[PDB]
Amino acid sequence: MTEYKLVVVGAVGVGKSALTIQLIQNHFVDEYDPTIEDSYRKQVVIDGETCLLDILDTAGQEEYSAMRDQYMRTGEGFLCVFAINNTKSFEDIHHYREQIKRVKDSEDVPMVLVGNKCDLPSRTVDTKQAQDLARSYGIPFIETSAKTRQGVDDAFYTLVREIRK
Amino acid sequence: MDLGKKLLEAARAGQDDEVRILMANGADVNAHDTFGFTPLHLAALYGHLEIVEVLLKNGADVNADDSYGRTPLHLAAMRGHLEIVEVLLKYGADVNAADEEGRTPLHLAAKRGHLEIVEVLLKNGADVNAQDKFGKTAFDISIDNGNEDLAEILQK
Ligand SMILES: Nc1nc2c(ncn2[C@@H]2O[C@H](COP(=O)(O)OP(=O)(O)O)[C@@H](O)[C@H]2O)c(=O)[nH]1
Ligand SMILES: [Mg+2]
């Protein structure tokens, strides 16, 4: 069965770990420690092909990581996560996309833009602004809620579909 | 009064004074957040040796595990906190403890490239050949990463 090395990137507190745990464990976490960088795995069925997900949930980017750099060189898809209530996280997408382009040495890498915490009533980051950025990058944009599971499978599924292409 | 939260925070932040005081007023060394981190997990993860010891000496559970099955030893290995790994063992940490994926501390250290910790775990009776629930072992991880120095340790 096929293995996909997925990298989850984005600013601290956007809900990367909360997304990873909702996908693999089917449970929401409030409080998950913000510097634990682990790679969780998950067997799924995507479009009739049993396949294995090997997801790195980046944390602690402040400090250096041997295994994080190795995941970045080798990784196959990227989830670029921002929070819909954090304008700084949206701005940081620019730096993450550019960093991926440089480590991978390629204008075209499998990527999905994720606007997390869409379960939330107040929203500082407009749907059009996010859709325009994804449309300028030529990549899908998916709204997600790690709390309600909305769009969570879709985000990880679409990325696997983008690697197949 | 919720001194469990006040103790966890203190353990993470490396405030050995606040930890001493908090326990003196009967704060529970096996408090845990909504994902099962004990003060020991946090101290280990964040590299706080004096705090790790004072927690253990005060009866903290060394083989406590979070809701993904990780012991404090797992986390100490994860980060490459060598002197902590040793004292966790000296106080009875299970070397071959397996998280929800079946990974032992050897897998995690091997995977991060923490070779000094791999050497020490093996010396305390780590099982070189244990498979996680997807079949992988330390040696699978060395080949999967092209890590030459690790694959060497795992033979001669
Ligand atoms: N309402 C809501 N809260 C979330 C969501 N995702 C994460 N959070 C919360 O935001 C905090 C940060 O999540 P975390 O996974 O630590 O993000 P990370 O720091 O990127 O790994 C936690 O308290 C989560 O409960 C979401 O989709 N909706
Ligand atoms: Mg996190």
Author numbering:
A (entry chain A): 1 to 165
B (entry chain B): 22 to 177
From the primary publication:
Wild-type Ras GTPases cycle between an active, guanosine 5′-triphosphate (GTP)-bound state and an inactive, guanosine 5′-diphosphate (GDP)-bound state1234. The P-loop (residues G10-S17) is responsible for phosphate binding, whereas the Switch I (D30-D38) and Switch II regions (G60-E76) are critical for interactions with guanosine nucleotide exchange factors and effector proteins.
DARPin K27 binds to the inactive GDP-bound conformation of K-Ras G12V burying most of switch 1 and leaving most of switch 2 exposed in the inactive conformation. However, in contrast to the Ras/Sos complex, the binding of K27 leaves both the switch 1 loop and the bound GDP in near-identical conformational states to the non-liganded, GDP-bound Ras, whereas Sos binding distorts switch 1, breaks the network of nucleotide contacts and favours nucleotide dissociation. In particular, the phenylalanine in DARPin K27 at position 56 would appear to clash with the main chain of active Ras in the switch 1 region (inset), whereas the switch 1 regions of non-liganded inactive Ras and K27 bound inactive Ras show near identical main chain conformations. DARPin K27 however shows novel properties for a non-covalent protein inhibitor of Ras, since it binds preferentially to inactive Ras and acts by nucleotide exchange inhibition, thus providing a new tool for investigating this mechanism of action.
